[PDB]
Design a protein around this ligand. Structure first.
Ligand code: MG
Ligand code: MG
Ligand code: MG
Ligand code: MG
Ligand code: NI
Ligand code: NI
Ligand code: NI
Ligand code: NI
Lengths: 388, 388, 388, 388
């Protein structure tokens, strides 16, 4: 069994992932900076499909227009030399001290206008480079204390910001959609739109909701103790899974951003099963941090492992679903019945149906086991490659 | 300072709260059952406005129609004798073994039809007793294992169920709205619609969304580590806060349902500040469990304390907002600016505005402190009644 | 590959595990009670080595001495007929309402004396049946509120209780040791001795510490977000791992008690690696609850799966440690150096050693990568049976 | 009511607390560096008793001996000019990249010897400045992955390190004790000795345990969902509370280090009640980070608020314990009985005592309520200054 990725697998990486220098709240960098060109080349050699960037990863904050142009031209040449694509881009509205109280929801109105202008400039660049999705991660939108932020006013400001961005895109005629990335906390004590559900709900209040989806990250929903495959199912059900960030997280703690497959391994299996069976066709993007224990050899080993673990889990999920004994077990657990309408006959027929209440044998129904444990042990056996 | 509740304060209690006998996963009941009539009388004497019920709290599961009628007539007489109201009602779709895999999203189709019929019968009763809101808590909708539940199919079934309920209500001409109560886990390993955000998002996919809101519970959002006042702000912003359940919870663990004011006390303060400043006009309902250490005297002491703590926090939040030094601090932290539009001048003017980018002094902006710590210490001083 | 357990594998089960009827805080039993004799027989057929019990699982609370004698005689015959052993026993000091504020640390002194007497009576029975370890799980020792329990007084009472139990055992000449089982919460809001560390620390203050060890449970340390293999390593390091309870838990929430291998699968792998490489020789006991969705067929499927998952992980951990490439990777990550003394040369030599400070090249040291990511991907490959 | 601290209150602050520049994992510094001399002066003016330091906060990493001497002389003059004391000091073994895999438990043996030498040099300085307690926080001792660290070997290395430090102190004749500071995670995925219990247990295996205690931090135990006052009670019970770090934390997430009184306010009340009623006489040290939203005015406001909130809670805990109605409630809840021995009469008398088992009326005992809810509402009323 080997598991070599190819660009057709649509694996992508942010520049800031393999380029993370290892600075954490308690320690200095353990690695030197990587030139974006070198990252593109190394990732292409590993079998990646593409890369993504924040404005500030590519063009140093404060660069002159002429320095701007040269950074972009070198990057473009790297993409041309390797066949790598740029499917997604985003804005850094969190590192510079001016964003210490947020970008779109900063209390200072002048900061909010600046955040919008910085964003628009990068949307134009994203379109130029061929990106299809523009992510917004409002990492500084939130508060450490209750009186610092009136959340209804802040949501008004957030809606206003996204509405203006949609006006811009439509007026310019750009073929790009937005994806909001939720996170419950860190670096703010609580972040606005903390989960996939809150982001989905917010989108429905925007002026042009069809332009907006979610970019969920495995570790972020897990920082709220939530079931990531369930949240992705809800996003797929809503037609809003525009992009996805893959990584690993061990429970409720700081955002670890481990390589994909690390952290909750069974959740990774059910996630891949869901993405492949739903036919999600977008990038498989890894937003991860090689641990700061590693040198550059360990950075590339960690990046390769992201892709490797996806392909192993893809093979095991596929074998699970194709196994005749598993298909029989799904029927024994009535997954087929779950998929049938409860009352296609309609309300009136349901009300008139004595077998649904008056004559329903609740005791006999209650006695039926669901057979879920046998089903779940077949899933475990498939995951571990122990089928017998 | 005294803090006596009156029915005008709109405090309400479920029958199942003061009536909880103390059975937990590891122990037998520590208290005898309470007759609903006796509960109505005792709560009226404490100053409560009303009570709520599950079908099965009022009418024993399996009761004959004639026994049904007598249970209702005695209850009605109790309400008549005391002036107590019944603003909300709900269905028990979780205790009986037939619901072990859910009600609306059970894999067995016959169980799903039964759950709908049991619900409709209680909606009619709720209307008869004057309830304005019908809550749905899908405590068994979910799974312990990944293959047991296809969540997209389950959401189809959940939508189907709520759509049929809305058809029923509209066809009957009833003046009642629905409120979905989220919970992330317990008793299932993961519960569908685990947070206020996921429930809000789901509602937007229903056929008649205006009939549906949320019933958030303080402890449930806290079981996901979320900021409850922030989630309530989002529900208010959306126009969907139809009902609310007040209690206390100490962190991420099993659902404690402590009396209101216990658990996260500062969160209770910011919640009351928000409810009163938004002019929420619905019931202040307590869904709590007197600890099983208590006898009946401690049950009524715990219930009284729920109301007492609300009224103390209401007085402290009001004093905070009325304090001229606090109003000056809110301006120093630019809460006034948060409430002003970022760009009422419009996209084009924003793009043409050199002071928003080209000439914006990012360094000067970054240097401005937000003054949030002084604001939060004034809030602490007000909460503790230590103002100087 | 097959994975059939035999009694030499020392797998054991509590009567209360497969016998759990499915009652949870929100629902009635979904299964009928099992006779202990039938459980012994079914578990023997599955390949179990032995069973464990609480006093009240075997002898109904309040039984007459003569009824007591018959329950024991039937049970003994079942053990004789099957070859099953009883390596551990414990006391129920949590179900009866008299224990609502604890057993050994109840505020009421008469309850504390009763708890000791109930315990001693079962120790005699445990010895008669051949148990080597007596577990104490103080599930009701704790509090929901801060003033209810003075924890220093409560620890005095807890020490007093365990000291008296050790006096009893030594005076009777019994060959039995005690194992304290920690749990952070549930059913009390906070439980005393909440983690393996707190229990280890407490033991050192007892009069005869050598008689006491810990019985850690996978899910309990995980309810505090802790690393279970790390806590077991500390218990092994201390010489105090007398018994262990195996199950699965998905994160910080209510105590799920899933079958072993469910929940955090990578943690299960590192745990088995540690137990087998340390040569832990005690029982592999499963304290788990077959989900209440299951009928009796699913109960036995869940029990079998506990044993199956242990044996698969045992095979994968063994292959990992035996793999020459893994041994080379451990050396590349300097695990060999971790095992060598830092300063066997002694304090004075260390102080005189200029290469340890004055002449140490901190920059060169800092540049060395730890190679942990490659090591961890070899572990992942072994776990998934994907080695190439 | 006013609440002005004086040096007799023994409030202390680390240099790194008010001096935190605001750099977090996602953002640059928002404040300029503070000179230690200026911090000493400002804190003295606020009423602080003293300051603490890491070696590297006072003497820049890599400083020449002569630069070392000047940094110390200026600092000493500041202490002399203000009357401020230095009760505790510690070592930075976490910021420099050489410590990326730990200090005392780094896999590289040469790094471990360096960490010891760096520590010893600062112990000498601590003694010179008058410190009584030397803290060790092993923030890098731990792992992100299971094979990276053999925890039994790592504990051997940790014991070896602390044993050598105790040899040094005793051989030099220094009057200083060590205090180990636990933390469950961050910056490592899991940190060794993650809680107060694990640190207490470890100490008992050291060669000279009387030289070692714990330095618990409010937020750290709360990052594991634990009850901080309960853990402090266990440390007091053991005679090992040598120092304490006060701050605030909102639940299980990244280490917030908010000002004391923020986060879990009721836990802060029960902590102060316990410290004052046990007569803890050590420093009240604040290890906190003024949020990076603040300018220097907000830094000093946050520091003042730490002290203010301690003094308010001290007044409320004292009023609670002195209230005759509270003393009557404590007796109603049998706290007096908790403090009496269970069996001072001895094992034999207990075994012979028919009223402890044979004739004990379990039903009557079970019926007695504990009256904890009334007690806890009196505590709430006292905390909020609402007594009536
Ligand atoms: Mg991301
Ligand atoms: Mg509720
Ligand atoms: Mg157990
Ligand atoms: Mg600290
Ligand atoms: Ni992340
Ligand atoms: Ni609840
Ligand atoms: Ni458990
Ligand atoms: Ni901290």
């Amino acid at each position: 069994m080997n598991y070599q990725p190819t660009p057709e697998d649509r694996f992508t990486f942010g520049l800031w992932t393999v380029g993370w220098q290892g600075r954490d709240p308690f320690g200095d960098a353990t690695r030197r900076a990587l030139d974006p060109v070198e990252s593109v080349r190394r990732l292409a050699e590993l079998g990646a499909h593409g890369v993504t960037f924040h404005d500030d990863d590519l063009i140093p904050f404060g660069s002159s227009d002429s320095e701007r142009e040269e950074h972009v031209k070198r990057f473009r040449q790297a993409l041309d030399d390797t066949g790598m694509k740029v499917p997604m881009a985003t804005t850094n509205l969190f590192t510079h001290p001016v964003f210490k109280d947020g970008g779109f929801t900063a209390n200072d109105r002048d900061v909010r206008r600046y955040a919008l202008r910085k964003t628009i400039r990068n949307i134009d660049l994203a379109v130029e480079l061929g990106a299809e999705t523009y992510v917004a991660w409002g990492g500084r939108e939130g508060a450490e204390s209750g009186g610092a932020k009136d959340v209804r006013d802040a949501l008004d400001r957030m809606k206003e910001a996204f509405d203006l961005l949609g006006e811009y895109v439509t007026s310019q005629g750009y073929d790009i959609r937005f994806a909001i990335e939720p996170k419950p906390n860190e670096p703010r004590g609580d972040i606005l739109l903390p989960t996939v559900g809150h982001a989905l709900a917010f989108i429905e209040r925007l002026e042009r909701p069809e332009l907006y989806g979610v970019n969920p990250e495995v570790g972020h929903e897990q920082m709220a103790g939530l079931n990531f495959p369930h949240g992705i199912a809800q996003a797929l059900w809503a037609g809003k899974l525009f992009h996805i960030d893959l990584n690993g997280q061990n429970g409720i703690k700081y955002d670890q951003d481990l390589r994909f497959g690390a952290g909750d391994l069974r959740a990774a299996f059910w996630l891949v099963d869901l993405l492949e069976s739903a036919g999600y066709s977008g990038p498989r993007h890894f937003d991860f941090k090689p641990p700061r224990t590693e040198d550059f050899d360990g950075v590339w080993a960690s990046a390769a492992g992201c892709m490797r673990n996806y392909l192993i889990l893809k093979e095991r999920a596929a074998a699970f679903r194709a196994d005749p004994e598993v298909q029989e077990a799904l029927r024994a657990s009535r997954l087929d019945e779950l998929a049938r309408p409860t009352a296609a006959d309609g309300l009136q027929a349901l009300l008139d149906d004595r077998s649904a209440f008056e004559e329903f044998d609740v005791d006999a129904a209650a006695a039926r086991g669901m057979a879920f444990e046998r089903l779940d042990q077949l899933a475990m056996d498939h995951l571990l490659g122990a089928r017998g």
